[PDB]
């Protein structure tokens, strides 16, 4: 026996070093979902241009790691919905990603932060 419940969160991708928009924010769907399922948080996303998103880990505030899955890797879409570990509470993840678009030779590792709209919620 398990539960879920979910709603949705927006965000916003910012620069390193600013609250600038980020072109990363971009590439994400929007708004995002808070999943609860058996009692564990996650932040589901969906990457836009997805063969070009190459890595993408997550980190907390704290410079915690947060597990990243694939839910759906999706080829004919060219998307990729993952799952984020996260605690309630969270208001910003740090992303280091590493994006390559090989055919004008674009091959960059980048730091952004992820804004919650507001804080992720506990769940019923
Ligand atoms: C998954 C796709 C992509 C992601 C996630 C992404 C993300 C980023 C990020 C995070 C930066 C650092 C500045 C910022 O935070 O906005 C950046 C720089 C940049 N990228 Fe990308 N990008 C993507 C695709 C592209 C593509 C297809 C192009 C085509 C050329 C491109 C061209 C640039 C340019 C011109 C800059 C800024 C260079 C400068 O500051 O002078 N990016 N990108």
Redesign the pocket.
Request: cysteine-free.
């Given at each position: 026996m398990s539960q879920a419940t979910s709603q949705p969160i927006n965000f916003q991708?910012?620069?390193?070093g600013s609250s600038?928009?980020?072109?990363?924010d971009?590439?994400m769907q929007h708004p995002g979902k808070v999943i609860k399922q058996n009692n564990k948080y996650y932040f589901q996303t969906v990457?836009?241009?997805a063969s070009?998103?190459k890595e993408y880990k997550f980190y907390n505030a704290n410079n915690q790691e947060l597990a990243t899955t694939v839910v759906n890797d999706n080829k004919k879409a060219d998307t990729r919905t993952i799952n984020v570990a996260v605690e309630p509470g969270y208001k910003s993840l740090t992303t280091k990603?590493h994006?390559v678009?090989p055919q004008?030779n674009?091959n960059?590792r980048?730091t952004?932060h992820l804004e919650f709209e507001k804080a992720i919620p506990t769940l019923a």
């Open positions: 991708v910012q620069k390193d600038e928009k980020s072109a990363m971009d590439y990457l836009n241009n070009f998103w990603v994006i678009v004008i674009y960059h980048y952004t």
